[PDB]
Amino acid sequence: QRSTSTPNVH
Amino acid sequence: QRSTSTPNVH
Amino acid sequence: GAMGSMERASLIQKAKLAEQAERYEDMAAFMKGAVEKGEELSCEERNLLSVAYKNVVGGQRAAWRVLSSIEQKSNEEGSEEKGPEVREYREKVETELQGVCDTVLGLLDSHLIKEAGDAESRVFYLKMKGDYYRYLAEVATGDDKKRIIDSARSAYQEAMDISKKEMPPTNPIRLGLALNFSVFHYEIANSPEEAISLAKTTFDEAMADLHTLSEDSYKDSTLIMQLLRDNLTLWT
Amino acid sequence: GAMGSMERASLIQKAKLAEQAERYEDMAAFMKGAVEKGEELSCEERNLLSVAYKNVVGGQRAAWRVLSSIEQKSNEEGSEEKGPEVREYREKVETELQGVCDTVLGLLDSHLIKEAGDAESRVFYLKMKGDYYRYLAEVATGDDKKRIIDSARSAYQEAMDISKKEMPPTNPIRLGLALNFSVFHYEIANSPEEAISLAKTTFDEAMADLHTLSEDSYKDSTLIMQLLRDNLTLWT
Ligand SMILES: *SCCC(=O)N1CCC(O)(c2ccc(Cl)c(C(F)(F)F)c2)CC1
Ligand SMILES: *SCCC(=O)N1CCC(O)(c2ccc(Cl)c(C(F)(F)F)c2)CC1
Ligand SMILES: [Cl-]
Ligand SMILES: [Cl-]
Ligand SMILES: [Mg+2]
Ligand SMILES: [Mg+2]
Ligand SMILES: [Mg+2]
Ligand SMILES: [Mg+2]
C-alpha cells in the first residue's frame, strides 16, 4: 500500500 | 432518474 | 491515420492493455485503427470496440448533462447573467461528443455493417448504429433532431427484425438490443407505452426460454432481464 | 497557445465549469491559459491549477502503475514472451506523464515562483515543484533519477525552510507540505526513518497549536493531521 499524499480540496 | 441501457461487459 | 503503421494484432493487444489501465480514449483509438485494417471483427474484438467507445461517449454524456443543467439554470428569471462562457463550454463538449458519435457511425458505415452477414455481428452493429444516433439525439435541438431520431429508430428496427428471426429470445445480443430500443422509446421518442410493452414482452419471452439454457448462459440472460425489470419498475 | 484569445476571467470561469463536469484535462488547459496571461494567481486560482493537474497526472500515474506491473510480470522466468507491445504502451503513457510534469514545472519556472513573494504563495508553488519532480522520480530509471530526486528534495527543503519561519505549525499549507515531503522520504528517497520523524514532529507540533484555532480552521488542520497519522500507522 502506498503512502497518502495531500488530496485535492475543491 | 434515467433509464438503464446495456452496460459494458469486459 | 496514426495507427496505420501498427500491426492489427498489436492494436488489439494494446486495446486490452488500455482497458486494464482504464485508458479508454487510447483503447478507442487502438480499436479504430484495428477496424481500419479492413478485416471483419471477431466477437471479442467487437466487444472491445463497444467497450472503448461507450466509455468515451459516456464520459462526454455525463459532462454534457452537467453543463446543460448549469446552462438551463443560468437561463431562468432571476439569474444573474454571467456571459457566454457556459454556453461556449457546453458547445465545446457537445461538439466533441458529436465527433465521437460521427466517428463510430463512420466505422459502421465504412464498412463494418455491409460486411457483417451473420446475425450475431450484424445485429450487434445495427444496435450500435441505433445507440450512437440515440446519443446524437440526446443533444440535438435544431432542424435535424427529427431526422436523427428516425435514423436511430430505423437502425434499431432493422436489428430487431433480424434478431427475432435469427436468435432465441434469451440471446444476450437480442436482449440488450430490446433493452436499448425500449430506452429509445421512453427517453427519446416520447413513447413510454411502447417502451413498457417492449420491455414486458421481451422479459416474458425470455423467462419462458430460460429452461433451455446452461448455468452460464442462464446467468448472462437473467442479468439483462433484471435490467428490463429495473426499467419497468422505474416506468410504472 | 490555443487559449491566447480567451479572457483570463473566462478561462477561470471555464476551469470551474470543467471541475464541475469532472473534465480535468480541459480544466488544466484552461488554467494553463490563465497562468500564461502573466498575472499572479489568487489562492482560489492556485487551488484550481493544483486540482486540475493533480487529477490529470493522477490518472496517468494510476495507468502507469498498471502497465509497469504487467511489464514486470511479463519479464520473469517462465513468462511467454509476447513482443514489444507492453513496453511500447507503458513508454507511451510514461512519456505523456513526463510531459504533464514538464508542463507544470515550466509554468512554475516561467514565472510563477519568481513572482511569488508571500509565504502562502511561494510555499505552495515550491511544494508543487517538489511534487512534480517526485512524480518524475516515480518513473525515472536512467542516469537522471538521482538528479530528479535531488531537484524534488531541494524544492521541498526551500519550501520547508520558509514554512517553518513564516507559518504556524497548524497552517494547512505547511501541514500538507510536510505530509508530502514525508512521502518523498519514505517512497522515493529510501529514508523511512526521516519520513517517520518528520510526520511525528509535524503532528505533535500541530496538536500543541490547535487550541489557537477556530472551529473551521481546527477542522482543516486536523483533517491533514489525520493523514500524517494514517501514514505513521502504515509505516510503523
Ligand atoms: S459477441 C457479439 C455480442 C457481444 O459482444 N455482446 C452482446 C451483449 C453482451 O452485452 C452482454 C452479455 C452478457 C451480459 Cl450479463 C451482459 C450484461 F448483462 F449487460 F452485463 C451483456 C455483451 C456484448
Ligand atoms: S490558498 C494557497 C494554499 C492552498 O490553496 N491549499 C493548501 C492546503 C489545502 O491543501 C488543504 C486545506 C484544507 C484541507 Cl482539510 C486539506 C486536506 F485535508 F488535505 F483535505 C487541504 C488546500 C490547498
Ligand atoms: Cl470553451
Ligand atoms: Cl503504443
Ligand atoms: Mg441579482
Ligand atoms: Mg451545438
Ligand atoms: Mg509456455
Ligand atoms: Mg521512458
Numbering used by the authors:
A (entry chain P), B (entry chain P): 255 to 264
C (entry chain A), D (entry chain A): -4 to 231
Copy text verbatim from the article accompanying this structure deposition.
14-3-3 is ubiquitously expressed in mammals and plays multiple roles within the cell, including phosphorylation protection, conformational changes, subcellular trafficking, and induction or disruption of other PPIs.13,27−29 14-3-3 typically binds to a phosphorylated serine/threonine in intrinsically disordered regions of its clients. Of the 7 isoforms found in mammalian cells, 14-3-3σ is the only one that harbors a cysteine residue proximal to the client binding groove, providing an additional degree of isoform specificity. The disulfide tethering screen targeted C38, a native cysteine on 14-3-3σ located proximal to the natural product binding pocket within the phosphopeptide recognition groove. We explored the scope of disulfide tethering for the discovery of selective PPI stabilizers (molecular glues) using the hub protein 14-3-3σ.
Stabilizer 8 had an almost identical structure to 7, differing only in a chloro-group in the para-position of the phenyl ring, and showed binding modes similar to 7 in its structure with C-RAF. Four of the nine compounds (compounds 5–8) showed activity in FADR and stabilization in the protein titrations. Of the 21 initial C-RAF stabilizers, 16 compounds showed selectivity for the 14-3-3σ/C-RAF phosphopeptide complex over apo 14-3-3σ and the other phosphopeptide clients in the primary screen. In contrast, the stabilizers of C-RAF were larger and showed more chemical diversity in their scaffold, emphasizing the flexibility of the C-RAF peptide.
